[PDB]
Amino acid sequence: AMEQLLRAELRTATLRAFGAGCISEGRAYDTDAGPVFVKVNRRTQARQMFEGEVASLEALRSTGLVRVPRPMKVIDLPGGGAAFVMEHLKMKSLSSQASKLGEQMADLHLYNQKGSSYVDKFGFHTVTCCGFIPQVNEWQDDWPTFFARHRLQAQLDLIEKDYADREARELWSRLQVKIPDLFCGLEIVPALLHGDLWSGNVAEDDVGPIIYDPASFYGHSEFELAIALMFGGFPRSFFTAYHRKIPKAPGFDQRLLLYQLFNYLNHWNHFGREYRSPSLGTMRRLLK
Amino acid sequence: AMEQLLRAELRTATLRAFGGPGAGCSEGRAYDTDAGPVFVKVNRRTQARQMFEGEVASLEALRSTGLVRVPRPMKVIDLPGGGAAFVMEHLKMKSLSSQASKLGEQMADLHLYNQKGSSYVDKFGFHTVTCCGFIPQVNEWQDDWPTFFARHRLQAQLDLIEKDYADREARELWSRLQVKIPDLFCGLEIVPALLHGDLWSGNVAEDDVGPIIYDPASFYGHSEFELAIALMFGGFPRSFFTAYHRKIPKAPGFDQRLLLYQLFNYLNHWNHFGREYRSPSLGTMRRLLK
Ligand SMILES: Nc1ncnc2c1ncn2[C@@H]1O[C@H](COP(=O)(O)OP(=O)(O)NP(=O)(O)O)[C@@H](O)[C@H]1O
Ligand SMILES: Nc1ncnc2c1ncn2[C@@H]1O[C@H](COP(=O)(O)OP(=O)(O)NP(=O)(O)O)[C@@H](O)[C@H]1O
Numbered sequence: 001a002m003e004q005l006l007r008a009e010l011r012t013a014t015l016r017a018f019g020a021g022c023i024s025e026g027r028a029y030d031t032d033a034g035p036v037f038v039k040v041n042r043r044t045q046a047r048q049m050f051e052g053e054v055a056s057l058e059a060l061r062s063t064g065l066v067r068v069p070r071p072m073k074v075i076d077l078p079g080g081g082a083a084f085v086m087e088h089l090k091m092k093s094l095s096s097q098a099s100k101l102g103e104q105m106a107d108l109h110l111y112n113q114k115g116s117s118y119v120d121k122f123g124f125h126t127v128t129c130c131g132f133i134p135q136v137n138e139w140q141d142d143w144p145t146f147f148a149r150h151r152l153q154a155q156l157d158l159i160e161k162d163y164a165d166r167e168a169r170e171l172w173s174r175l176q177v178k179i180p181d182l183f184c185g186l187e188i189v190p191a192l193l194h195g196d197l198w199s200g201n202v203a204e205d206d207v208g209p210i211i212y213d214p215a216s217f218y219g220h221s222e223f224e225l226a227i228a229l230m231f232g233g234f235p236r237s238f239f240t241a242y243h244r245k246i247p248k249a250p251g252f253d254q255r256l257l258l259y260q261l262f263n264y265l266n267h268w269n270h271f272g273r274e275y276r277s278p279s280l281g282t283m284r285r286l287l288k
Numbered sequence: 289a290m291e292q293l294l295r296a297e298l299r300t301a302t303l304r305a306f307g308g309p310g311a312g313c314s315e316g317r318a319y320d321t322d323a324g325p326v327f328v329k330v331n332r333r334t335q336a337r338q339m340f341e342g343e344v345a346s347l348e349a350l351r352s353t354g355l356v357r358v359p360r361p362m363k364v365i366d367l368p369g370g371g372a373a374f375v376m377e378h379l380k381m382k383s384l385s386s387q388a389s390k391l392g393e394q395m396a397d398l399h400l401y402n403q404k405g406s407s408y409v410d411k412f413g414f415h416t417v418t419c420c421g422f423i424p425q426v427n428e429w430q431d432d433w434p435t436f437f438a439r440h441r442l443q444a445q446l447d448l449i450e451k452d453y454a455d456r457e458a459r460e461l462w463s464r465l466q467v468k469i470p471d472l473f474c475g476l477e478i479v480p481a482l483l484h485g486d487l488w489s490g491n492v493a494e495d496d497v498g499p500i501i502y503d504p505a506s507f508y509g510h511s512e513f514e515l516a517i518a519l520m521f522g523g524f525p526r527s528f529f530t531a532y533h534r535k536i537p538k539a540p541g542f543d544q545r546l547l548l549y550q551l552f553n554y555l556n557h558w559n560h561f562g563r564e565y566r567s568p569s570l571g572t573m574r575r576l577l578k
């Protein structure tokens with residue numbers, strides 16, 4: 001993949017990714033009680049965004065299965081927005097701890113089935129944000145319904161409002177009809193998700209892997225992996241370890257396109273028309 | 289300010305900033321290598337290589353002046369499955385602050401370089417296509433700056449807006465505005481000036497040695513165009529503009545031309561990001577028509 005190509009093209013033995021951001025400003029500070037990490041966002045919806053991240057961090061931390069920063073405080077800023085203070089963790093990009101993270105992510109997804117966890121619907125107890133965009137987490141018994149309505153339709157409604165894109169509307173109407181067939185008659189079980197498991201949101205230290213910047217809800221376990229695959233950066237051993245514990249159910253490859261579609265639509269909304277072509281192309285591929 | 293607010297909320301005397309860049313953005317990714325750090329941009333669309341070649345050409349034109357620090361382009365790689373990656377030198381960088389007045393001086397020198405040097409580019413435009421963001425621009429050489437700008441910047445953006453949005457108000461306001469443009473340029477000498485082309489605050493930075501600028505979309509234009517995007521989204525210290533205008537003072541009619549150049553950037557933002565930018569685009573046209 002991209003990293004092997006870079007090593008070859010640049011003729012370098014080492015190639016360690018770095019591991020602030022597109023959404024919020026981020027800075028570490030030393031304080032009298034030790035280091036902290038602070039995210040700042042000046043938009044009006046900052047507090048909602050950070051409160052969703054606090055809720056997500058707390059939900060993951062309650063499982064005891066993965067290491068994530070402790071949320072400390074959400075502070076309103078004069079002049080608009082908010083700051084979010086959390087535990088500082090010394091970190092480097094994910095490399096040797098990839099297979100351990102695959103194990104942990106599979107255990108996290110399986111926790112709702114095997115732990116003392118009783119969540120039998122999809123969604124979440126509070127609003128979480130995809131980036132800047134507030135999400136509806138209203139509980140639903142049917143995962144394809146929840147995902148179609150509260151993830152894909154929400155993004156395409158925003159595309160319609162802001163871009164008024166005819167091809168996106170027309171393709172979505174056809175894709176809506178196909179979505180149930182992609183699920184192969186499977187019984188989907190709710191799985192607690194990190195929700196934004198891009199390679200830039202995972203890392204490691206000497207103890208093991210670390211994950212951060214979650215946007216959590218109870219979803220289909222497979223949705224977690226789509227963004228990890230589409231932007232790369234995870235070693236193969238991450239997926240090997242994960243699928244040893246959660247094998248690919250039938251139709252996985254086609255659902256992967258559906259879940260990657262969501263992320264393309266989200267990037268179209270956050271980052272503009274550069275992401276129109278992969279959004280439409282993915283829909284067309286699903287409709288072929 | 290925000291750091292006093294953190295000291296109070298956390299009840300700490302010290303609040304000492306520290307630490308590295310991190311993972312980052314749709315912008316790209318940084319890597320440590322055997323030859324030092326690199327930064328890699330990736331775009332999987334079929335036009336990725338054209339886009340990055342425009343950026344390399346822009347970086348090379350700026351580096352040739354020796355007046356401003358930009359990352360050295362290293363390689364453009366065709367990606368399996370379509371698109372390309374662009375590798376350049378990595379620079380450890382912070383937001384522009386202490387080096388703002390130095391950057392103002394360099395940017396003025398950059399704009400004066402073509403007029404004052406030996407080899408003189410005597411038209412507006414560029415020898416290759418460059419993208420301001422993702423949309424390719426036409427850089428066809430033109431003797432007359434208001435012609436170049438109206439045709440290959442404003443009309444190009446408005447044609448896209450007509451194609452994709454069929455916006456009645458934009459269409460009618462452009463029919464009225466187009467004829468008024470020459471009034472903003474009469475009685476002034478406009479010399480082609482090499483521009484960075486996308487100098488908003490998010491494309492400039494600094495390190496211990498001096499300021500750095502990057503992500504250019506270069507062409508030969510009216511020097512004032514450079515400043516429109518810098519002003520309109522803020523983020524530059526006042527001393528940047530003070531130092532700049534000590535060397536190139538604001539010519540008569542500067543504030544009205546500033547609206548025209550800001551209009552271009554608003555139209556470009558509408559084509560990139562949608563209707564959130566319709567209101568400033570149309571309103572800027574109305575201001576110009578009053
Ligand atoms: N708790 C932490 N302690 C130390 N460093 C951190 C911590 N959280 C994040 N970082 C670093 O700072 C970066 C900020 O990441 P993140 O919070 O995910 O971005 P963001 O502000 O939401 N904007 P975006 O990247 O577009 O999502 C990460 O790559 C890490 O390198
Ligand atoms: N040479 C460099 N070395 C290190 N970091 C860099 C370098 N160039 C850019 N960056 C970082 O990457 C960010 C974006 O760089 P930029 O050239 O503007 O990317 P971009 O792809 O054009 N952005 P986008 O329009 O969203 O795709 C900067 O804000 C820096 O943090």
Ligand SMILES: O=C(CN1CCOCC1)[C@@H](O)[C@H](O)[C@H](O)CO
Nearest residue numbers: 130131132196198231270313314
């Ligand atoms: O920003 C994120 C990851 N993408 C950044 C742009 O380059 C590709 C990876 C995630 O935090 C998330 O998918 C979304 O962008 C939040 O808006």
Ligand SMILES: O=C(CN1CCOCC1)[C@@H](O)[C@H](O)[C@H](O)CO
Nearest residue numbers: 420421422486488521556557560
């Ligand atoms: O992204 C750019 C600057 N704008 C980003 C949204 O906040 C206001 C500043 C530039 O690269 C360019 O002027 C154009 O937006 C296409 O990317």
